[PDB]
Amino acid sequence: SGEYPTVNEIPVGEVRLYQIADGVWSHIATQSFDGAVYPSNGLIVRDGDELLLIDTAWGAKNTAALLAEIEKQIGLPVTRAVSTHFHDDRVGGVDVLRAAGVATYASPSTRRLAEAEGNEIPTHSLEGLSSSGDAVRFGPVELFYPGAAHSTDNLVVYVPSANVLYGGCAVHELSSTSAGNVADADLAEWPTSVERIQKHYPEAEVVIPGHGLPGGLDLLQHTANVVKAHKN
Ligand SMILES: CC(C)c1cccc2c(-c3ccc(CNS(=O)(=O)C4CCNCC4)c(F)c3)c(C(=O)O)[nH]c12
Ligand SMILES: [Zn+2]
Ligand SMILES: [Zn+2]
């Protein structure tokens, strides 16, 4: 009923949308992994009379449900999607998207890692993002590569019209007590990568983590703090 929806409020296989700003929504879904259930976020950005999707809803059937929820709530076609790293909460569902006519994109790094992992592979490579600090425009967003953090390939996404920073899995929610799933992380570089984000987007008003509740700029420092305390 209007609060941001949490893991125990969303059955696996349903998707919720949350209005962040004019023309900006998050999507929230839940999935089982290794015997536990987790929420995850993505982004939807209005692109004239079309929509840009950032990240899948973590699985094929969740992503089909995402498309249906978009049609219900927004009613504009999703024409392009960007996946912000290679894990299944970001690319699982790309095959569903592709067969719905969505053009799917990711950095070459992400594409390689997805293929090596046996995950679904976005079709199109996003060049111009290979060095930390790189940025490119993609429809109504800017894509930024901050350096290795949660994963070596993680991208963040900024919506300049709304000052919305979508950190993806490089950014954790304020209630977070741990650095999440660090199996592919660089704990040593993660703070430095977060500092790059902080420097590059000082006017961000809303920060959206890859999992959990949006907030303000404090999510960035909180993330650095939790990662440093984990590494220790
Ligand atoms: C490899 C990919 C597909 C993957 C698989 C499985 C899990 C993860 C996570 C992940 C894991 C745990 C948390 C925090 N625990 S929690 O359950 O969400 C929270 C607990 C107390 N209150 C509310 C709920 C978290 F935020 C993220 C991440 C990530 O960190 O990017 N990636 C994952
Ligand atoms: Zn991940
Ligand atoms: Zn994640």
- Give me the residue label for tokens 């990711």: 106
How many Cα neighbours within 13 Å face the side chain of 18?
21
**Domains in the chain, please, with CATH?**
7-231 (3.60.15.10)
Q: Cβ(150) to ligand 1 under 6 A?
A: yes
Cα 211 to averaged position of ligand 3 atoms, centre (Å): 6
Q: Cβ(181) to ligand 1 under 6 A?
A: yes
Residue 216 is classified by DSSP as -
Q: Cβ(89) to ligand 1 under 6 A?
A: yes
User: Would you say 184 is a known binding-site residue?
Assistant: no
Sequence-separated contacts (24+) of 142-148 with Cβ below 8 Å: 143/82, 144/197, 144/200, 144/201, 145/107, 146/170, 146/193, 146/194, 146/196, 146/197, 146/200, 147/189, 147/192, 147/193, 147/196, 148/185, 148/186, 148/189, 148/190, 148/193
Q: Cβ(169) to ligand 1 under 6 A?
A: yes
Distance CA 187, CA 167 (A): 16
Distance CA 59, CA 215 (A): 26
DSSP output for 66-129: HHHHHHHHT---EEEEE-SSSSHHHHTTHHHHHHTT-EEEE-HHHHHHHHHHT----SEE--S-
User: Would you say 211 is a known binding-site residue?
Assistant: yes
Cα 176 to averaged position of ligand 1 atoms, centre (Å): 10
DSSP output for 165-191: EEEETTS--TT--S----TT--TTTHH
What CA–CA distances, in Å, run from 225 to 46, 167, 178?
33, 16, 10
Residue nearest (by alpha carbon) to ligand 1 atom 1: 87
The contacts of residue 131 (CB under 8 Å, 6+ apart) are: 145
Distance CA 196, CA 152 (A): 15
